[PDB]
Amino acid sequence: PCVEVVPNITYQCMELNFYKIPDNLPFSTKNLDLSWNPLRHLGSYSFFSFPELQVLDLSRCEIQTIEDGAYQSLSHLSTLILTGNPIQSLALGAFSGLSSLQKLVAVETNLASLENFPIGHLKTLKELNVAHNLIQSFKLPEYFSNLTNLEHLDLSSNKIQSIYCTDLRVLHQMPLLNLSLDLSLNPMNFIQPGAFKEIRLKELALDTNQLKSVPDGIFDRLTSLQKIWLHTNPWDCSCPRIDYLSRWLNKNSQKEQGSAKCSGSGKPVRSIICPT
Ligand SMILES: *[C@@H]1O[C@H](CO)[C@@H](O[C@@H]2O[C@H](CO)[C@@H](O[C@@H]3O[C@H](CO)[C@@H](O)[C@H](O)[C@@H]3O)[C@H](O)[C@H]2NC(C)=O)[C@H](O)[C@H]1NC(C)=O
Ligand SMILES: *[C@@H]1O[C@H](CO)[C@@H](O)[C@H](O)[C@H]1NC(C)=O
């Protein structure tokens, strides 16, 4: 037994030195916290005895691998947290059976590429958090065209250096309703002209990166955009290089959260007026 938070519903099994999933818990359990347990590896049907699971926290469980069908029976699960696991191998069917998964948190799991991240069948997914990883390319794999319900994608604190036009290809031909994209805290110093064309976005975070400039009209092909973060970037406010951005930011002051500032002087980019 773990700490019973709610009878036959919620149990807290964090740090009890478990190496296997507990079998002495109600089959009606909805919430399970198994964080901080040397689980090391997950085999097929690891949670067969918990068909009612909706939220599963497995962060910091020293997990290295996950075999096909590890969560095969959990068809009611909507939140899976894998934060802090030194994952090194991820089978193709590792997330098989998660037909209701809405939130996947894979922060700090040594993720190096989205291509090999076997999540292309989680059509019900609404939130994907892969912040604090080793991803160095923002090129979205073709399977993203099946994630029609995605409204939040967090790629902050990774190794992304730039955003090419091709990177959002998949979203061009299979647009989402209200997508919020977080790309802050990346060593990003380049955005290719027309990389956000035909793209629909509700939020775009690009603060605390390495940007000095952006292509002209980069944000013209957008209207659903509501919030944007550009602060904490070494903006080059010489003219006419800063012309488009300074004007855009001034004609959209409500959208910008925080304040993009000019390197050196510290003057708001939206306050600069370039000569004609
Ligand atoms: C948490 O789950 C346990 C077990 O599932 C609940 O206790 C169990 O309650 C059932 C009644 O729904 C008991 O089963 C049988 O009930 C009939 C009533 O008609 C009675 O005639 C039988 O003799 C028998 O009791 C079962 O014995 C009982 N088991 C336990 C745990 O003692 C418990 O109520 C649940 N707690 C919550 C969240 O309310
Ligand atoms: C998308 O999902 C369908 C249905 O399972 C599958 O056949 C297809 O290969 C997947 N990839 C594509 C085409 O985006």
Numbering used by the authors: 28 to 303
Paper text:
Toll-like receptor 4 (TLR4), a superfamily of LRR proteins, is the principal receptor mediating innate immune responses against infections by Gram-negative bacteria. In an attempt to prevent the systemic immune response caused by LPS, a TLR4 decoy receptor was constructed by combining LRR modules from the TLR4 ectodomain and VLR. The constructed decoy receptor was shown to attenuate the TLR4-mediated signaling process by trapping MD2, implicating a potential therapeutics for bacteria-induced sepsis and inflammation.
Changing phenylalanine at position 63 was likely to form a hydrophobic interaction with Ile-66 of MD2 in the crystal structure of the decoy receptor/MD2 complex. Phe-63 was substituted for tryptophan and leucine for the interaction with Ile-66 in MD2. The F63W mutant displayed increases in the Coulomb interaction and LJ potential by 17.08 and 11.02 kJ/mol, respectively, indicating a significant enhancement in the hydrophobic interaction, as expected. Trp-63 concurrently contributed to an increase in the charge interaction via additional hydrogen bonding with the residues on MD2. The crystal structures of the selected single mutants as apo and complexed with MD2 provided detailed information on the interaction modes of the residues at the interface and the contribution of mutated residues to binding affinity. Superposition of the mutants on the wild-type revealed that their original backbone structures were retained, which represents the structural characteristics of repeat proteins.
